[PDB]
């Protein structure tokens, strides 16, 4: 989407680790 508003959990391939944006 556009933003994320909801502290939703989110995977960062880039790190390799799920955190919360």
Do not use: A, L
């Not at 933003?3 to 959990?9: F, G, L, R, T, Y």
């Not at 391939?13 to 799920?18: A, L, M, S």
Request: charged fraction near 30%.
């Amino acid at each position: 989407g556009s933003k994320k508003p909801v502290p939703i959990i989110y995977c960062n391939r880039r790190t390799g680790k799920c955190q919360r944006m």
